[PDB]
């Protein structure tokens, strides 16, 4: 009966769920636990290039704090 | 009577046009009615997409404040009280 379509429904479900979590976890692994910043404007890009310049490593996924 | 008959006919024959024209009328008309319209311009004037360059005090202008947190300037409290 109608309980024979699940072996395709669940398949499509998992294979449409994989890309989202893939992207999220991958962005997070790269940028160190925090998501990938976005720049709809020049303001955020200025912030990002500033953090890049002061990272001491030339990468922006480093937030310093008050110990600088 | 003729109008009423025509609409009693259209409301079964071709409603699409009735809905369209009613929506059109509502759109052209309500803005002149509602009280919450001007508030939009007030808001989009308040929104500071730029920097408010200040001025000097070589005169006796008492309106402008010497500090942001002071009360002598234009308020918008109605925004949060909305």
């Amino acid at each position: 009966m109608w309980f024979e379509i699940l072996p395709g429904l669940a398949i499509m479900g998992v294979c449409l769920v994989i890309p989202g979590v893939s992207t999220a976890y991958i962005h997070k692994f790269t940028n160190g636990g925090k998501e990938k910043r976005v720049a709809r404007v020049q303001y955020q890009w200025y912030l990002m290039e500033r953090d890049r310049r002061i990272s001491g490593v030339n990468r922006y996924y480093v937030s310093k704090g008050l110990e600088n | 009577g003729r109008i009423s008959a025509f609409l009693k006919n259209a409301w079964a024959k071709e409603p699409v046009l009735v809905v369209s024209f009613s929506v059109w009328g509502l759109a052209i008309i309500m803005p002149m009615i509602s009280p919450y319209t001007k508030y939009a311009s007030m808001i989009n004037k308040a929104t500071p997409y730029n920097y408010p360059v200040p001025v000097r005090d070589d005169g006796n202008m008492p309106d402008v404040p010497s500090h942001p947190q002071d009360p002598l300037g234009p308020s918008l409290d109605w925004l949060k009280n909305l």
Partner: protein, 96 residues
């Protein structure tokens, strides 16, 4: 509900822009000092680079103004590497 939510979004936007407002001055001064150092270095190098030629000048303002002049990224990063010139030009335009 859409209205009551859009208004709250406008309030949040005002908050963020007020933060940016309070921070603009600092950033302005940092940027100014940075570009001034940049030009000073371009000059300290230009000196030795083009001292051996005839009737050449040093920081010769191509204008007759005495007015300050927003310098071009061309001038500033014209002696640094393609890396920086492009990280400047195509930075916001190549998706972060």
């Amino acid at each position: 509900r859409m209205m009551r939510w859009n208004q709250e979004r406008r309030r949040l936007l005002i908050e963020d822009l007020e933060a940016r407002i309070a921070l603009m001055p600092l950033f302005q001064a940092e940027k100014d000092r940075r570009t001034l150092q940049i030009l000073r270095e371009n000059l300290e190098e230009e000196a030795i680079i083009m001292k051996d030629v005839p009737n050449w000048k040093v920081g010769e303002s191509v204008f007759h103004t005495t007015r300050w002049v927003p310098p071009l990224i061309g001038e500033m990063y014209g002696l640094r590497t393609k890396e920086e010139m492009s990280n400047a030009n195509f930075g916001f335009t190549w998706y972060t």
